[PDB]
Amino acid sequence: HGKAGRKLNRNSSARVALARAQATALLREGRIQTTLTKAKELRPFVEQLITTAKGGDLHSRRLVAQDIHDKDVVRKVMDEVAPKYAERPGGYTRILRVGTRRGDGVTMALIEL
């Protein structure tokens, strides 16, 4: 078979620098457009990241800094975003698929908070 559990597009360091870069991006900008797949892949990673940061303990922060190597952003998610997302069970992230593209013909989508 192949009944595993994740996606891959490149190697091992890649899917990482990706998920990180994109998580940072979204956290910073509140909404981004990207390929529907990359979006799908980002959803749970970032949801989980809110839940970590959603703790307040310096630990939780120092955890979050492993992924978000941008200070302004760590502070944002930590002190602003997490707090706000305090009463809702989990995960406020949603995906809206725009439409096909011209360059390569790939369906695009928007992920946002």
Binding site: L96, R97, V98, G99, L110
Partner: protein
């Protein structure tokens, strides 16, 4: 080159092969906001709504 074909193929055969190449027509919907036709489970590229309006017109 080992992968060579014996005879040239007939118009007939060479077309029967292509009898599976017909693109499907995009099933389009009517947008309940700006009466424009859009793609199901997507966002109306015209007015920009999808239950209230998301993208910039």
């Amino acid at each position: 080159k080992h992968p060579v074909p014996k005879k040239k193929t007939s118009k007939s055969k060479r077309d029967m092969r292509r009898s599976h190449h017909a693109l499907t027509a995009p099933n389009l919907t009517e947008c309940p906001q700006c009466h424009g036709k859009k793609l199901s489970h997507h966002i109306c590229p015209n007015c920009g709504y999808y239950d209230g309006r998301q993208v910039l017109a």
